[PDB]
């Protein structure tokens, strides 16, 4: 199947009471493999997946150096944005950055991304053409002009299409036992008699990896897309995920409904029906 | 705006003394570094930084310490100066992005000595134009000679009628050693100021060669019978003449 | 690829008015930028041009440089060279991996642009100290740029290198060298040989 490598960065100003907080995390698909936290005693980029541990001292030194440089760029950015928005210096603000690349089943480049947000809102993003920018508002037009003048899109395009895809492949191969593994969901259905004449049928998918999964309910043979209760996929805490889909049905008619589960770990899609 | 600012520009130290070279930049640069360059030799990185709280070693970190507690400053500390540390130091900064253009500070010349009795200020003299040059070329060359100084920390300038001049002036790119057989040889530096014969012949024109010497400070121990060789200006002058 | 920057020739000597070319070569093409500097003896470094990996060339007055990142080389071109162009030209590159951002410098190319002396009139003059003084110096001046000024070895007798001065208001320039000695039996006649 397809894969992705993504880095996430969070920068939060803590005016008066400390330097800004800087947290960086890296992921290959739904597996976190590295982390950096400016508040930790270490001051080192740290391993979070088993396979990255085969990287040597040079790798760790280089990544630790690049993540500190990112922290400094963000440290400056906080003040720059505060100025653009004529904001007070007593308040706490947040800058977020995310970048990465996706490859297909054949490990060939599919797409790149580089997005930036201020106070939980889009600020500036690199378009899919990896050449131009989408600036959310007016202050972002200022950053956009500086990024065009400095040719930031060309700088990013070189990394995203090259370095990013090369290392993603190296990691997929080095951590194949787990990264290229596929934990098929364990499914079951529960029944809860909610009120007279009705009952809730809840379809479960547990202990699955990767996180992508499609749970659907049909009545007779028709999709019940608009009438299905679907919870956000959640982590189990052991590297796998959980999710459920529920439908409200009339009592005595639960066997007209079928839950369908689609996942990469399953040879073919599963159909569940209440006993 | 101000660019990279390094201080001090000149400094003499006795072996074992502590010293801090300051390096400031007002461009929000993330990358800052320190280099040492021996006369006629290449630039060698001492230490560098890419962020507040981050410092890493270069090629020659031994004997030096750095710190980066602020975005703007990257001070180089010499805990106990050694004669081997006598060199020219440059601090350089840049963004860790944009065009990555590097910016160098103006440089700091440090001389470390086992004993400060080797430090001498310059004696200066101005030599008047030859009457033969005047009649032969209709031009007049004055020569300034700064002699017996150590270390080689001088800046020579010509002043004509109270204003500094650059046209018709050429000063030796480097001083020469008075005693080439010695390591701590004192130096001599020469300069020429060429004007028209008629300008030299005008008794109203005043010519002055000044040499700013950077030596010891008012806070340095001095056990020699001669005057303490402190940072000072030493100059010589000549007035134009009809004869 | 451990980066290594080379600059050949290491020394270059041309007559003023001629266009010239300085070379820079690097072993690893994976660079972020290449930057040209200039440095005179006893002075600092002045940045001349900066070429990012996305540009192919830059221009600044009489100076222009090209960057052929794929073939690992850059060329600095200087038009209508002037004696003031005389200095050591340095080329440096920045890396694209490692997180150090440390530049790699070449050793540099020493450039000497010789002035055009249209009416040579070589002569050695004796100049007296304005203070008094029994002291004097010898001045060798107005010689062409092909003249070599070496020091006929003799401790106690000092001889400087040739130096160029421009009398700009009169579109005139001349070469000179100075000699002096502490010995009485010293004469300007046998000062420069």
């Amino acid at each position: 199947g397809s894969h992705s490598m993504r880095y996430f960065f969070t920068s939060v100003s803590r005016p008066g009471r400390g330097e800004p907080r800087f947290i960086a995390v890296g992921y290959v698909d739904d597996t976190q493999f590295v982390r950096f936290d400016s508040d930790a005693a270490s001051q080192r980029m740290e391993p979070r997946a088993p396979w990255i541990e085969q990287e040597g001292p040079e790798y760790w030194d280089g990544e630790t150096r690049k993540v500190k440089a990112h922290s400094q760029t963000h440290r400056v950015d906080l003040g720059t944005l505060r100025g653009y928005y004529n904001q007070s210096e007593a308040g706490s603000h947040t800058v977020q950055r995310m970048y990465g690349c996706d490859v297909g089943s054949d490990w060939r480049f599919l797409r790149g991304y580089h997005q930036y947000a201020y106070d939980g809102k889009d600020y500036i993003a690199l378009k899919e053409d990896l050449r131009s920018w989408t600036a959310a508002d007016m202050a972002a037009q200022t950053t956009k002009h500086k990024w065009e003048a400095a040719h930031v899109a060309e700088q990013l395009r070189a990394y995203l299409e090259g370095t990013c895809v090369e290392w993603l492949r190296r990691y997929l191969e080095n951590g194949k036992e787990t990264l290229q593994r596929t934990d098929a969901p364990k499914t079951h259905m529960t029944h809860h008699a909610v009120s007279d004449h009705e009952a809730t049928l809840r379809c479960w998918a547990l202990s699955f990896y990767p996180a992508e999964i499609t749970l659907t309910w049909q009545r007779d043979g028709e999709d019940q897309t608009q009438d299905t209760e679907l919870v956000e996929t959640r982590p189990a805490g052991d590297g796998t995920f959980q999710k459920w889909a529920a439908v409200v049905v009339p009592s005595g008619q639960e066997q007209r409904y079928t839950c369908h589960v689609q996942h990469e770990g399953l040879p073919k899609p599963l159909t569940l029906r209440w006993e | 705006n101000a660019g990279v600012t390094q201080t001090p520009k000149f400094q003499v130290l006795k072996t074992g003394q502590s010293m801090t070279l300051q390096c400031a930049q007002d461009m929000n640069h993330e990358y800052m570094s320190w280099y040492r360059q021996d006369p006629g030799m290449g630039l060698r990185l001492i230490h560098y930084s890419v962020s507040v709280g981050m410092t890493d070693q270069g090629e020659v970190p031994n004997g030096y310490n750095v710190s980066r507690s602020t975005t703007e400053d990257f001070p180089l500390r010499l805990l106990s100066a050694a004669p081997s540390q006598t060199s020219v130091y440059f601090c350089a900064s840049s963004y860790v992005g944009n065009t990555g253009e590097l910016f160098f500070g103006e440089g700091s010349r440090l001389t470390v000595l086992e004993d400060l009795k080797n430090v001498f200020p310059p004696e200066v003299a101005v030599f008047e134009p030859s009457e033969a040059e005047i009649s032969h070329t209709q031009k007049a060359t004055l020569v300034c000679l700064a002699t017996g100084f150590y270390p080689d920390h001088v800046e020579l300038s010509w002043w004509v009628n109270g204003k500094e001049v650059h046209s018709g002036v050429c000063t030796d790119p480097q001083p020469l050693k008075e005693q080439p057989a010695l390591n701590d040889s004192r130096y001599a530096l020469s300069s020429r100021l060429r004007v028209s014969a008629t300008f030299w012949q005008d008794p109203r024109n005043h010519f002055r060669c000044q040499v700013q010497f950077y030596g010891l400070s008012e806070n340095d121990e001095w056990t020699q019978d001669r005057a303490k060789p402190v940072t000072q200006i030493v100059s010589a002058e000549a007035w134009g003449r009809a004869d | 690829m451990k980066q290594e920057v080379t600059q050949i020739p290491a020394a270059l000597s041309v007559p003023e008015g001629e266009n010239l070319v300085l070379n820079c070569s690097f072993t690893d093409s994976a660079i972020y930028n290449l930057q040209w500097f200039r440095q005179d003896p006893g002075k600092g470094l002045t940045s001349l041009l900066l070429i990012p990996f996305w540009q192919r060339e830059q221009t600044s007055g009489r100076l222009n440089a090209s960057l052929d990142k794929s073939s690992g080389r850059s060329t600095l071109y200087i038009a209508a060279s002037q004696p003031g162009d005389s200095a050591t030209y340095l080329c440096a590159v920045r890396p694209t991996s490692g997180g150090s951002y440390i530049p790699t410098f070449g050793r540099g190319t020493s450039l000497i642009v010789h002035p055009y002396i249209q009416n040579p009139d070589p002569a050695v003059y004796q100049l007296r100290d304005s203070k008094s003084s029994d002291k004097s110096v010898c001045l060798f001046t107005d010689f062409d740029s092909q003249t070599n000024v070496s020091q006929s070895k003799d401790s106690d007798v000092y001889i400087t290198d040739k130096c160029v001065l421009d009398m700009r208001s009169m579109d005139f320039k001349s070469n000179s060298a100075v000699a002096w000695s502490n010995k009485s039996d010293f004469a300007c006649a046998n000062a420069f040989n």
Partner: peptide
Amino acid sequence: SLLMWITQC
């Protein structure tokens, strides 16, 4: 592996 050259906003 992280991006090396990063530009201020």
